[PDB]
Design a protein around this ligand. Structure first.
Ligand SMILES: *[C@@H]1O[C@H](CO)[C@@H](O)[C@H](O)[C@H]1NC(C)=O
Ligand SMILES: *[C@@H]1O[C@H](CO)[C@@H](O)[C@H](O)[C@H]1NC(C)=O
Ligand SMILES: *[C@@H]1O[C@H](CO)[C@@H](O)[C@H](O)[C@H]1NC(C)=O
Lengths: 64, 49
């Protein structure tokens, strides 16, 4: 969940190491930061069951 | 399906379905938004066997 929107992975799954959330491919553990370039948005944060709160990184803002 | 090609790997059932929906060309968000509808249709289909 981010800013009231539901973000889903383009590929792979979301996993937590106990303190931080990452997105990784299913057949081999190789975690990366969750960003707008590896997720897609569909529906709001209220429609998905089991949805959790986090921040999704936007790679374009640091240069603006 | 993982236990059929190696060690068994636990997964939430709703996520197992999400993979199976992607496998037929239907974006996984369809499952989550309609999880209750899908579970209900399943329950009915099994009951009629
Ligand atoms: C999770 O990964 C982050 C980044 O490497 C690390 O800082 C944090 O300590 C890890 N958490 C645990 C419980 O290992
Ligand atoms: C997961 O299952 C437990 C029961 O063991 C239940 O209390 C919990 O609410 C469930 N969480 C989700 C997201 O379904
Ligand atoms: C996420 O945080 C909001 C407050 O901004 C809260 O209302 C909502 O219930 C939280 N959702 C989850 C899954 O923790």
């Amino acid at each position: 969940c981010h800013d009231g929107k539901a973000h889903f992975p383009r590929e792979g799954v979301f996993v937590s190491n106990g303190t931080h959330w990452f997105v990784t491919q299913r057949n081999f553990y190789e975690p990366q930061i969750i960003t707008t370039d590896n997720t897609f948005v569909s529906g709001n944060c209220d429609v998905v069951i089991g949805i959790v709160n986090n921040t999704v990184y936007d790679p374009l803002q640091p240069e603006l | 399906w993982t236990f059929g090609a190696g060690p068994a790997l636990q997964i939430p059932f709703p996520m197992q379905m999400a993979y199976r929906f992607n496998g037929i060309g239907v974006t996984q968000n369809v499952l989550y938004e309609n999880q209750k509808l899908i579970a209900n249709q399943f329950n009915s289909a099994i009951g009629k066997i």
